[PDB]
Amino acid sequence: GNFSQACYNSAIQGSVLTSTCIRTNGGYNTSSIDLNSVIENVDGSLKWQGSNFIETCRNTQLAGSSELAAECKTRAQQFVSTKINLDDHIAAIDGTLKYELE
Amino acid sequence: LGNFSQACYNSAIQGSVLTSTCIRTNGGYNTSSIDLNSVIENVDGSLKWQGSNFIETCRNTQLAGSSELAAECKTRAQQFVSTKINLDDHIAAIDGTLKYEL
């Protein structure tokens, strides 16, 4: 992960993270990744290893350099604040944002 | 051709993201990932190629065997069925990187 260490002017809109990242050999590339592919809402908490958090979460924001903040519905249907560190699994690979397992 | 599974190993599915470790012509290997949500559609509960966005209406994605995406998806009438699709149809590995083909 650790995309934030090579990237700049990151933004979250709905489920999409977009950033501008330093390419391996120099210069910059801009790319987007749909976080809905890899994050789920488990009882009001954003978690890795699932998908479709956006179905039941709203008001997504980038907090600081690398955190996705949102309000997600608990099983009781109460919106609650939740955050997840995108640096856990999102890498910058030659200036392009990619999900990383290992 | 697709057929990434013959070039790759240690494959996994998390949300809509396929990760796999694929052979490099230099004699090494590269771990990469692809968002299958760009290329797979939920059509009335069945996973199909020639579309996108299946994660919005499916759940419990899993890799079955070496190359099958399995999931539970909502029909147009909003009931869940189990469905599968052979990722080897269109997912290829080119020099250690997963790519969509044709």
CATH entry, B1-102, from 3.90.1150.10, 2.40.128.260, 2.40.170.20, 2.30.60.10 = 2.30.60.10
Q: Judging by beta carbons within 10 Å of its beta carbon (0-12, 13-18, 19+), is residue B77 exposed, middle or buried?
A: exposed
Domain chopping of chain B, boundaries: 1-102
Q: Are B99 and B77 in contact (CB under 8 A)?
A: no
**From the list A49, A52, A55, which residue is nearest B14 (CB)?**
A49
Which residues 34-93 in chain A show a CB within 8 A of chain B?
34, 36-40, 48-52, 55
Put residue B32 in one of left, alpha, beta given phi > 0 → left and psi -120 to 50 → alpha.
Answer: beta
Residues B41-62 as b/e (b if ≥16 CB within 10 A, e otherwise) read bbbebebeeeeeebbbbbeebe
Q: Which residue of B has its CA nearest to A15?
A: B56
CB contact under 8 A, B12 and A101: yes
Which neighbouring-strand residues pair with B18?
Answer: B13, B34
CA distance A81 to chain B (A): 22
Per CB-CB distance under 8 Å, the chain A contacts of B12 are 101
Token pair listed for B17: 């993201």
Please give the order of strands across the beta sheet that includes A7-13: A7-13, A16-22, A28-34
